[PDB]
């Protein structure tokens, strides 16, 4: 009754005094860690600045041991700065604002990467079903617009997640983010395409390409998740045992990627041919052929570059 | 030369030993603060759970002093939990992922709110210029699609920023985020609208409404930034001196908002009337009239609710 409520409230008040002391100490160590953290970041930035000044002096001065020690120094400074907050890029400051997406611990980085891979897998599952209903079951304009809008949203959120990953350590190559922007522009151009003969002569091929891109993204998720888990296992306790599986997966994955690149080039050439028809009143065909060509060129060059990098090392 | 480089490298190595010790201590206090922070969050959650259990017991038990102390307790617990990380919502976990957007210090919250207001102001400036070129200068379909796409992007990023603000303390009412989703859906529906007589009979009115909404957003930014700066000044050292200006700004701002609500209702009624024409082959008019009606209803009810709340207190 009232006595039980009063006794429970007294116990809650004693626990409240304890938790208020705990929170005051928490705020104290939070301010102390913020001050020390800003000091550490400023000192690493000035250390890197003076090291780069010495580097540009020594580059025009000419020994090799100094170069090796400086390269090791720069690599470990990159790791240390990745452990610290790295502020935000241009796109992250534009969209997300002046907020810190840090994920300071390495386990947090792994969890974010795994959740990003699973997010890509689930949106791949959803996109392949919607592309299947658009290409085969239903020939409507409402569902194609819905598919293109979900493609735009998926690529924009993937750009946001990849910028977050870049902000903390991850070596996402700069082409893939621009790939996401160009694919967003492509789906936006396809959204504004009015219904007609030119749209119907390309819609089935575009939806089949989207279906194949999602199917390739399935295997990409499998390879990337396996590689991430193998790096996590090999990192702590559990080199040659990982590379073999990594190269087997890369060799199994490369022909599908190259067929996707050639399909992108084929879509670009098909849109370029369709833009020359007498029954071509839409500017969307010519302004949509260019993103497929750009995607083919950039993706093919980047894939060949990373394959050459993997073979070299 | 080589001797100068060696001496500079030795000095950099001594500073490196210092900064490596500093970083090791930083990692130590980071792990300690993370452990204490998780302990504090768990203890606040269990304290709030037991307090709510006692609250639901005492509500059906019936004293008033207990209710007043419990209300003060819940308010200060909300402030304490807002100082701590509050995880992520459904939308933030969907888009941003499992990353912490915290802004732990109150100054960080103020800086993020001010940057959000300035972002809204700059996008308002850009949107009013593009809407001016679309409504008056150029009657093209490319520029209207660009305006609608920028509207979609602006509303999506505004949804992201508002979810971030909700995640740390800010009392953004839940209607405004859904306002942003419904406006995104409206602009997406307008994107898929094919060119025709029905589109041309509504395009000028919609662009004029967008121009007026941006003009109202200018005054909204002015009022919100002034209110935020007045709360910041009055909060530290520098009640009646703020309320008077706040109510003057609210009284100057309310007729513009109500005219915007009536314009939203007028656009809904105009689209409902246009959907009944014999020359109406587009479903976009009927599926676009509904978001204007929903926006009018929700925005008008929410504005009247917050005005009644401000007048009551
Ligand atoms: C080689 C490839 C298959 C992956 O190999 P890889 O192990 O990731 O090698 P990388 O050098 O690129 O790895 C660097 C980082 O970039 C990331 N990354 C690689 N490819 C990426 C992509 N397409 N998107 C986002 N991130 C990517 C990796 O996860 C990796 O993460 P990390 O920081 O922990 O190291 C890569 O080229 C790829 O993913 N290509 C996809 C191209 C494509 O899909 N084209 C369309 C076909 S229709
Ligand atoms: C009354 C009004 C004008 C602002 O008054 P207010 O001082 O912000 O009062 P609130 O109760 O809403 O403030 C609570 C919080 O919500 C925020 N907020 C208020 N209106 C908001 C909005 N439209 N969008 C995002 N956030 C908003 C405030 O910044 C405030 O921040 P806080 O956490 O620091 O306290 C508000 O109703 C409003 O902004 N309406 C806009 C409606 C509109 O634009 N319709 C379209 C016209 S065409």
Author numbering:
A (entry chain B), B (entry chain A): 8 to 69, 80 to 255, 261 to 335
Can you list sentences taken from the study reporting this PDB entry?
TMEM120A, also named as TACAN, is a novel membrane protein highly conserved in vertebrates and was recently proposed to be a mechanosensitive channel involved in sensing mechanical pain. Here we present the single-particle cryogenic electron microscopy (cryo-EM) structure of human TMEM120A, which forms a tightly packed dimer with extensive interactions mediated by the N-terminal coiled coil domain (CCD), the C-terminal transmembrane domain (TMD), and the re-entrant loop between the two domains. The TMD of each TMEM120A subunit contains six transmembrane helices (TMs) and has no clear structural feature of a channel protein. Intriguingly, some structural features of TMEM120A resemble those of elongase for very long-chain fatty acids (ELOVL) despite the low sequence homology between them, pointing to the possibility that TMEM120A may function as an enzyme for fatty acid metabolism, rather than a mechanosensitive channel.
Human TMEM120A was expressed in HEK293F cells using the BacMam system, solubilized in lauryl maltose neopentyl glycol (LMNG) detergent, and finally purified in digitonin detergent as a homo-dimer ('Materials and methods'). The single-particle cryo-EM structure of TMEM120A dimer was determined to the resolution of 3.2 Å. Dimerization starts at CCD where the exceptionally long (~60 residues) CC1 helix forms an anti-parallel coiled coil with CC1 from the neighboring subunit. The re-entrant loop of each subunit is tightly wedged between the two TMDs of the dimer at the internal leaflet of the membrane. It mediates another set of extensive dimerization interactions through predominantly Van der Waals contacts with the re-entrant loop from the neighboring subunit as well as the internal halves of TMDs from both subunits. This insertion of the re-entrant loops between the two subunits splits apart the two TMDs at the internal leaflet of the membrane and consequently the two TMDs make direct contact only at the external leaflet of the membrane through some hydrophobic residues at the external parts of TM2, TM3, and TM6, rendering the TMEM120A dimer with an arrowhead-shaped transmembrane region. The transmembrane α-helical barrel enclosed a deep pocket only open to the inside but completely sealed off from the outside. Thus, no discernible ion conduction pathway is present in the TMD of TMEM120A. Despite the low sequence homology, the 6-TM barrel structure of ELOVL7 is strikingly similar to that of TMEM120A (TMs 1–6) with a main-chain RMSD of about 2.5 Å between their barrel-forming 6-TM helices.
